[PDB]
Amino acid sequence: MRVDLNSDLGESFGRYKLGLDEEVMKYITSANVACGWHAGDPLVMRKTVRLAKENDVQVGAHPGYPDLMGFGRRYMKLTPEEARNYILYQVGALYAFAKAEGLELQHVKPHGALYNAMVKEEDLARAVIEGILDFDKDLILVTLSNSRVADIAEEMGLKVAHEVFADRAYNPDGTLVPAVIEDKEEIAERVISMVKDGGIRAINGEWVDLKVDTICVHGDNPKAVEITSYIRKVLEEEGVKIVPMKEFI
Amino acid sequence: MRVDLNSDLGESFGRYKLGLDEEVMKYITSANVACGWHAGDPLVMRKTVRLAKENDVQVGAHPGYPDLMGFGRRYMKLTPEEARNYILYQVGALYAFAKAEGLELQHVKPHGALYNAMVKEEDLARAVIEGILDFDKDLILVTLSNSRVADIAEEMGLKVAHEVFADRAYNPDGTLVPAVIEDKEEIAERVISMVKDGGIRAINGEWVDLKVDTICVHGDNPKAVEITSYIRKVLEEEGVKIVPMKEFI
Amino acid sequence: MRVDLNSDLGESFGRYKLGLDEEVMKYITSANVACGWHAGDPLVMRKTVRLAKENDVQVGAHPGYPDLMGFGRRYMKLTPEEARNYILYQVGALYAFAKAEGLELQHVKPHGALYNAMVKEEDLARAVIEGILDFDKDLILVTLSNSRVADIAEEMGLKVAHEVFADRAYNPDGTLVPAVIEDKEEIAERVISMVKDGGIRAINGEWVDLKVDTICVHGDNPKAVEITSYIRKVLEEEGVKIVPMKEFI
Amino acid sequence: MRVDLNSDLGESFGRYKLGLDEEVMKYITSANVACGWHAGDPLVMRKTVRLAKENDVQVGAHPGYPDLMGFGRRYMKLTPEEARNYILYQVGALYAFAKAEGLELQHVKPHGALYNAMVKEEDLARAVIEGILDFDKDLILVTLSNSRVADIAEEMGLKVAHEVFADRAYNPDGTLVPAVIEDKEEIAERVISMVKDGGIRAINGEWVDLKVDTICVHGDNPKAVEITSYIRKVLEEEGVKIVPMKEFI
């Protein structure tokens, strides 16, 4: 068993500090760094990439819609070429920071509403993938496990990592319900089911098959960091190899 | 005699078309593409880089202050690390587009107020140069001919190209007066003096020594494109080799 | 017969000049001034309001989505309270300029994608109307002639002006086709049919009943200004009283 | 003895919560609400104004430079007409929210770098005051106690409130040192000296005469709220009347 632990970092902006990046960076293998559009800024990006380097964490881009006010959690209708180039712009911006710190970008994980819209609109998913291919065909796309987005990525020649969410309730079709488990013990249970059994039961009890390459964890507060630490703890005890996506995708 | 002809392009934004990029691209050797902060956007950047590729024009970054409303022509007080990373962010953003089109970035020419502030503040000039070095130590910095900025670049190990302005009046110290010659014949005269004699007379008649590596030309309207075409015309007749900076810097 | 002529003005931004505001201001009765979100800025707003005052033109707000890059022509999913307060913010911003010039705001006409989304989503139309009511219950909402938006405005107690587009093709249901008549003679024909006959034929020939309170005209270029002048010309010859909405709504 | 207690509120933005507005709103008499340029947004503005109404707190505008990334703490060179209209825009935006909640704006207190720049540049101070006069000549300007800005306001016909900072060290000339007292007991001491003795000693021991109309207090965290509560506590014990500026300016 092998799995990657990813977390959205560098989500602070200007005067506002969001999350506990340095703390959670001690448990994850991959960081999805905001690119200044839905969150983050140059100073936050440089700091986050530096922290990743010091913690031996892989850096990937976390592009989003041009909506700071909405934290990229609101749908914006974009043409395919707009989405393609908007993704390209953000990946390049973050790349400069990885380069400045002697690191290489590993992946690209779209943020919030963009992530959700790609799952629902195949043309948008294709546009985003095209933007990634424009920059580096070796980049790994992080998307919803077993989703059509993954099939499209494979069809277009882009490596893809199937992402699961242990603290989120699932619908029978594999999509997430718009319930969020809060106790670390229960979350740990779900993590084990996913890695050990390749699935989890949906809110109606139906079994959902899941490909597990990476698990999204959080570090918004001490409590979240606590849960993340425990997830790592349990995975280690189960003999699961915790390694970055680049090592097995 | 050899010289590069550079022009600020991709200065359009959203709905607004600024300049005649495709037309002027036929006469220049280097394009300074806006990076979305003071002007430009992802679509404009992609289009401008594509046009450069088709016209065999070298692409360089034209970063500016985060002030769209002011077109980057207003001073903003930045800390050295802010300036360093703000430059890095914009260079990376443009790099993605050059990469997408199979091109390599050649230079970095700061825009408007940032360009002027670097000439006046050595600590700011150093911060910008550090940001460029963070990305690619092979990039060429375009700055005011014979200015202290050029000396600082050399001291820090960054190649630098001395820029002159044939349609701008000069002060005895080599800085530009905050008068803009309008007739192409007169502008052509100044171009010849600079390349042929390594200088020009200031507004008070005093001779100003100038190192001439690149000449800034414009394409804001048919008239400007006309002047630019004539400048190329006259330089050709004088036996001057018109080639991109990378070939001789 | 009476009718108002409105035009979207103050759509310039920063360095970019858009349209021929001063010229077209000589023919219209109402100006819809951008509020800095999809276009416009403080200087453009002050200038446009000053021009309206000098030309005895009524000023109204032209709020849009927070998307400068897309000129407010892209749908953004907003919650009802977000839309309500986003409208309120923009109306207040423009109000300050009307006040500074001794003028009172007459109306509110949503811009681009927001205008279109209101026609399609009753909850969004209601949210926008609530925002207007929050500021001044005497403001007139400009919306698509005979649309459900108008009925909602009436139900909520807000005066509404039915808007028609003489240079746009219509669908049988009263909505516009996503064709734009270009010859002023033909446009003039449509203007006459609307004011004289209270309707126009859709693209399939079916008659469309239209309430005509205000006609949207343009001034993007000399040609558009030419058409606008002609529209005024023909309306005058037909004995139609050209007056601002406040005089008859 | 009478004094107003003001605090910068509504400084949150989008996803980011800054300060403890509702808590500190229980001790102050005047709130300086951000206008969306350096901080704040429509939802934060509406919420803050609603909270002020519920706590019987006066609302004033807290305009700043168009620099979210820098939280308005960075100098930006503006022309007098730019500053005038930039202030006007923000005051109007906030006014809409006060109006929506049945409240009237009481004052205008510039934020961060703009506040500091006005103290240093008389032409900028004049431009800001002109912008306020453009909107409502009855608005009160909050500025540095005994500063030239206050004299300019008086000369231009705008009421002005002299502001002091009990937790900040002073220079002999009345300006603040770029030290911040942290213990509430010491801060309380300074508050008493200012209200009781009309002054405080500068860092070098020299007595500084101060006009005391309003005291800036904070609510960034429980500790700051604690200090603010204590300040109110001590002022009450000293028999000082704590009332909003409009009641005595």
Tab-separated table of C-alpha atoms in Angstrom, chain A:
chain	number	residue	atom	x	y	z
A	1	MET	CA	0.000	0.000	0.000
A	2	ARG	CA	1.256	3.454	-0.940
A	3	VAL	CA	-0.375	6.866	-0.715
A	4	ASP	CA	0.362	10.574	-0.955
A	5	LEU	CA	-0.917	13.171	1.509
A	6	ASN	CA	-1.648	16.549	-0.086
A	7	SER	CA	-2.838	19.804	1.460
A	8	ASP	CA	-3.832	23.212	0.099
A	9	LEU	CA	-1.234	25.655	1.412
A	10	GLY	CA	-0.167	29.253	0.892
A	11	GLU	CA	-3.809	30.284	1.112
A	12	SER	CA	-2.980	33.363	3.152
A	13	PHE	CA	-3.129	36.743	1.409
A	14	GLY	CA	-1.623	40.115	2.216
A	15	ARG	CA	-2.314	40.883	5.876
A	16	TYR	CA	-4.344	37.716	6.425
A	17	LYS	CA	-2.796	34.531	7.787
A	18	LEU	CA	-4.789	31.415	6.938
A	19	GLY	CA	-3.975	27.944	8.214
A	20	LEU	CA	-0.904	26.562	9.987
A	21	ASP	CA	1.292	25.776	6.981
A	22	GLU	CA	4.625	25.193	8.718
A	23	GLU	CA	3.011	22.836	11.213
A	24	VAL	CA	1.076	20.693	8.743
A	25	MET	CA	4.049	20.695	6.356
A	26	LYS	CA	5.643	18.250	8.802
A	27	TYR	CA	3.135	15.507	7.968
A	28	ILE	CA	2.351	15.805	4.256
A	29	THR	CA	4.160	14.732	1.100
A	30	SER	CA	2.625	17.239	-1.338
A	31	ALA	CA	1.581	20.894	-1.047
A	32	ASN	CA	-0.893	22.591	-3.401
A	33	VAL	CA	0.202	26.231	-3.399
A	34	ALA	CA	-2.255	29.008	-4.290
A	35	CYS	CA	-1.186	31.179	-7.234
A	36	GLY	CA	-2.447	34.648	-6.340
A	37	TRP	CA	-5.804	34.487	-8.110
A	38	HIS	CA	-8.185	33.021	-5.527
A	39	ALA	CA	-5.707	33.358	-2.670
A	40	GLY	CA	-1.991	33.732	-2.018
A	41	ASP	CA	0.433	36.429	-3.187
A	42	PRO	CA	4.154	36.600	-4.134
A	43	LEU	CA	5.424	36.755	-0.551
A	44	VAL	CA	3.154	33.916	0.576
A	45	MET	CA	4.186	31.860	-2.440
A	46	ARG	CA	7.915	32.334	-1.794
A	47	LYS	CA	7.494	31.508	1.904
A	48	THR	CA	5.390	28.410	1.233
A	49	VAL	CA	7.817	27.064	-1.356
A	50	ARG	CA	10.724	27.707	1.021
A	51	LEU	CA	8.878	25.822	3.765
A	52	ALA	CA	8.174	22.924	1.410
A	53	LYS	CA	11.866	22.733	0.511
A	54	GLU	CA	12.879	22.665	4.184
A	55	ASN	CA	10.339	19.934	4.949
A	56	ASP	CA	11.109	17.849	1.861
A	57	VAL	CA	7.555	18.359	0.573
A	58	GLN	CA	6.709	18.368	-3.135
A	59	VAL	CA	5.270	21.563	-4.599
A	60	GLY	CA	2.363	21.682	-7.014
A	61	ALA	CA	0.183	24.508	-8.334
A	62	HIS	CA	-3.293	25.188	-6.910
A	63	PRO	CA	-4.797	27.511	-9.566
A	64	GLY	CA	-8.270	28.963	-9.224
A	65	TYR	CA	-10.750	31.436	-10.656
A	66	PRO	CA	-9.863	35.157	-10.656
A	67	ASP	CA	-12.066	35.794	-7.620
A	68	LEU	CA	-10.233	36.741	-4.417
A	69	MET	CA	-13.386	38.029	-2.764
A	70	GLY	CA	-14.980	34.600	-3.181
A	71	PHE	CA	-11.828	32.590	-2.432
A	72	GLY	CA	-12.313	30.877	-5.782
A	73	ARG	CA	-15.386	29.063	-4.481
A	74	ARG	CA	-17.767	30.600	-7.025
A	75	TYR	CA	-18.387	29.360	-10.555
A	76	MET	CA	-17.275	31.708	-13.334
A	77	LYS	CA	-18.154	30.910	-16.939
A	78	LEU	CA	-14.955	30.781	-18.967
A	79	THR	CA	-14.355	29.915	-22.607
A	80	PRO	CA	-12.063	26.917	-23.151
A	81	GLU	CA	-9.199	29.133	-24.308
A	82	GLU	CA	-9.685	31.438	-21.326
A	83	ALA	CA	-9.510	28.518	-18.889
A	84	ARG	CA	-6.496	27.102	-20.729
A	85	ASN	CA	-4.498	30.318	-20.495
A	86	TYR	CA	-5.690	31.261	-17.014
A	87	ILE	CA	-4.305	27.929	-15.768
A	88	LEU	CA	-1.088	28.436	-17.740
A	89	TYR	CA	-0.553	31.897	-16.216
A	90	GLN	CA	-0.902	30.633	-12.632
A	91	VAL	CA	1.301	27.589	-13.176
A	92	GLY	CA	4.039	29.808	-14.585
A	93	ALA	CA	3.764	32.242	-11.683
A	94	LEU	CA	4.242	29.462	-9.123
A	95	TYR	CA	6.958	27.808	-11.200
A	96	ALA	CA	9.120	30.904	-10.767
A	97	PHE	CA	9.083	30.376	-6.988
A	98	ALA	CA	9.841	26.658	-7.216
A	99	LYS	CA	12.740	27.518	-9.549
A	100	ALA	CA	13.972	30.244	-7.197
A	101	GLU	CA	14.183	27.634	-4.438
A	102	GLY	CA	15.763	24.934	-6.597
A	103	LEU	CA	12.620	22.814	-6.759
A	104	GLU	CA	10.597	21.364	-9.634
A	105	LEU	CA	6.795	21.475	-9.818
A	106	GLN	CA	5.230	18.048	-9.324
A	107	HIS	CA	1.525	18.550	-9.920
A	108	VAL	CA	-1.467	20.795	-10.537
A	109	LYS	CA	-4.613	20.587	-8.425
A	110	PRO	CA	-7.404	23.028	-9.381
A	111	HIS	CA	-9.049	24.898	-6.498
A	112	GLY	CA	-12.623	25.022	-5.233
A	113	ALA	CA	-15.283	25.895	-7.795
A	114	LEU	CA	-12.885	25.291	-10.686
A	115	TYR	CA	-12.173	21.776	-9.387
A	116	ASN	CA	-15.909	21.125	-9.066
A	117	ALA	CA	-16.748	22.630	-12.463
A	118	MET	CA	-14.170	20.428	-14.195
A	119	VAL	CA	-15.883	17.356	-12.769
A	120	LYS	CA	-19.199	18.576	-14.225
A	121	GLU	CA	-18.054	20.015	-17.562
A	122	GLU	CA	-15.870	17.866	-19.800
A	123	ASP	CA	-14.981	20.777	-22.096
A	124	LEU	CA	-13.677	22.777	-19.129
A	125	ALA	CA	-11.710	19.789	-17.804
A	126	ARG	CA	-10.134	19.425	-21.247
A	127	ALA	CA	-9.234	23.136	-21.398
A	128	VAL	CA	-7.488	22.972	-18.018
A	129	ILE	CA	-5.589	19.836	-19.016
A	130	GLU	CA	-4.546	21.536	-22.271
A	131	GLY	CA	-3.174	24.446	-20.252
A	132	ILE	CA	-1.127	22.079	-18.116
A	133	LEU	CA	0.158	20.273	-21.214
A	134	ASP	CA	1.145	23.685	-22.619
A	135	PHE	CA	3.550	24.134	-19.714
A	136	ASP	CA	4.956	20.687	-18.912
A	137	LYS	CA	3.562	17.372	-20.123
A	138	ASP	CA	5.213	15.706	-17.125
A	139	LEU	CA	3.009	17.468	-14.563
A	140	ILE	CA	0.514	15.336	-12.640
A	141	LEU	CA	-3.124	16.426	-12.489
A	142	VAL	CA	-4.867	15.830	-9.170
A	143	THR	CA	-8.581	15.206	-9.636
A	144	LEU	CA	-11.597	13.414	-8.162
A	145	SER	CA	-11.002	9.667	-7.865
A	146	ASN	CA	-12.510	7.632	-10.726
A	147	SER	CA	-14.019	10.760	-12.274
A	148	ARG	CA	-14.369	11.392	-16.000
A	149	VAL	CA	-11.697	14.088	-15.604
A	150	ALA	CA	-9.116	11.365	-14.969
A	151	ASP	CA	-10.163	9.485	-18.100
A	152	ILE	CA	-9.860	12.686	-20.127
A	153	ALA	CA	-6.384	13.343	-18.712
A	154	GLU	CA	-5.281	9.836	-19.683
A	155	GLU	CA	-6.760	10.289	-23.151
A	156	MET	CA	-4.837	13.555	-23.577
A	157	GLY	CA	-1.563	12.072	-22.340
A	158	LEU	CA	-1.345	13.711	-18.914
A	159	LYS	CA	-0.536	11.647	-15.818
A	160	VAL	CA	-3.293	11.867	-13.222
A	161	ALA	CA	-3.586	11.150	-9.497
A	162	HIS	CA	-6.904	9.993	-8.066
A	163	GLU	CA	-7.804	12.046	-4.994
A	164	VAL	CA	-10.036	11.001	-2.091
A	165	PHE	CA	-11.413	12.905	0.914
A	166	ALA	CA	-11.572	10.963	4.188
A	167	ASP	CA	-13.467	13.675	6.087
A	168	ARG	CA	-16.169	14.138	3.449
A	169	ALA	CA	-19.376	12.169	2.878
A	170	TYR	CA	-19.784	10.555	-0.552
A	171	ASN	CA	-22.702	10.162	-2.948
A	172	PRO	CA	-23.104	6.751	-4.636
A	173	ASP	CA	-21.672	8.125	-7.884
A	174	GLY	CA	-18.339	9.036	-6.309
A	175	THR	CA	-18.978	12.760	-6.000
A	176	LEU	CA	-18.938	14.498	-2.626
A	177	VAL	CA	-22.060	15.703	-0.870
A	178	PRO	CA	-22.028	19.531	-0.847
A	179	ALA	CA	-21.402	16.493	5.749
A	180	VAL	CA	-17.833	16.810	7.048
A	181	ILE	CA	-16.795	14.230	9.651
A	182	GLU	CA	-15.102	16.002	12.556
A	183	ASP	CA	-13.720	13.359	14.930
A	184	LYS	CA	-10.243	12.112	14.022
A	185	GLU	CA	-11.079	8.532	15.015
A	186	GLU	CA	-13.889	8.308	12.448
A	187	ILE	CA	-11.808	10.074	9.805
A	188	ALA	CA	-9.025	7.579	10.478
A	189	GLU	CA	-11.543	4.768	9.939
A	190	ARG	CA	-12.433	6.136	6.522
A	191	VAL	CA	-8.775	6.577	5.608
A	192	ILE	CA	-8.153	2.900	6.371
A	193	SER	CA	-11.172	1.719	4.380
A	194	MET	CA	-10.045	3.705	1.358
A	195	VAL	CA	-6.417	2.554	1.321
A	196	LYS	CA	-7.105	-1.006	2.550
A	197	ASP	CA	-10.362	-1.721	0.721
A	198	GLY	CA	-10.285	0.647	-2.240
A	199	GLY	CA	-13.590	2.229	-1.343
A	200	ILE	CA	-16.037	3.635	1.180
A	201	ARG	CA	-19.808	3.552	1.696
A	202	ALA	CA	-21.848	6.487	0.413
A	203	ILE	CA	-24.349	8.321	2.618
A	204	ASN	CA	-27.018	5.808	1.587
A	205	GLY	CA	-24.801	2.847	2.444
A	206	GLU	CA	-23.934	1.915	-1.135
A	207	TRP	CA	-20.326	0.896	-1.639
A	208	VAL	CA	-18.274	3.334	-3.710
A	209	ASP	CA	-15.150	2.065	-5.483
A	210	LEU	CA	-12.234	4.463	-5.164
A	211	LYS	CA	-8.747	4.584	-6.644
A	212	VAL	CA	-6.518	5.976	-3.899
A	213	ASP	CA	-3.379	7.845	-4.940
A	214	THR	CA	-3.602	10.918	-2.742
A	215	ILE	CA	-5.602	11.974	0.301
A	216	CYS	CA	-6.471	15.624	0.906
A	217	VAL	CA	-5.690	16.659	4.475
A	218	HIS	CA	-6.000	19.990	6.284
A	219	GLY	CA	-4.136	22.339	8.601
A	220	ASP	CA	-6.536	25.249	9.097
A	221	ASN	CA	-6.264	25.067	12.899
A	222	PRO	CA	-4.590	23.007	15.686
A	223	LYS	CA	-7.524	20.582	15.540
A	224	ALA	CA	-7.114	19.965	11.810
A	225	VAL	CA	-3.353	19.554	12.230
A	226	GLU	CA	-4.157	17.084	15.009
A	227	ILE	CA	-6.368	15.027	12.680
A	228	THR	CA	-3.735	15.151	9.941
A	229	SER	CA	-1.067	13.923	12.349
A	230	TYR	CA	-3.343	11.070	13.416
A	231	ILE	CA	-4.057	10.118	9.804
A	232	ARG	CA	-0.314	9.844	9.228
A	233	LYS	CA	-0.049	7.911	12.497
A	234	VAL	CA	-2.659	5.308	11.545
A	235	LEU	CA	-1.366	4.919	7.978
A	236	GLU	CA	2.113	4.215	9.351
A	237	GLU	CA	0.744	1.575	11.714
A	238	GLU	CA	-1.080	-0.104	8.819
A	239	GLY	CA	2.200	-0.434	6.965
A	240	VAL	CA	1.196	2.023	4.251
A	241	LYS	CA	4.087	3.739	2.497
A	242	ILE	CA	3.554	7.505	2.643
A	243	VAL	CA	5.349	8.978	-0.358
A	244	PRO	CA	4.897	11.831	-2.875
A	245	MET	CA	2.892	11.239	-6.059
A	246	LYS	CA	5.916	11.535	-8.353
A	247	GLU	CA	7.272	8.310	-6.880
A	248	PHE	CA	4.382	6.118	-8.034
A	249	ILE	CA	2.082	7.888	-10.505
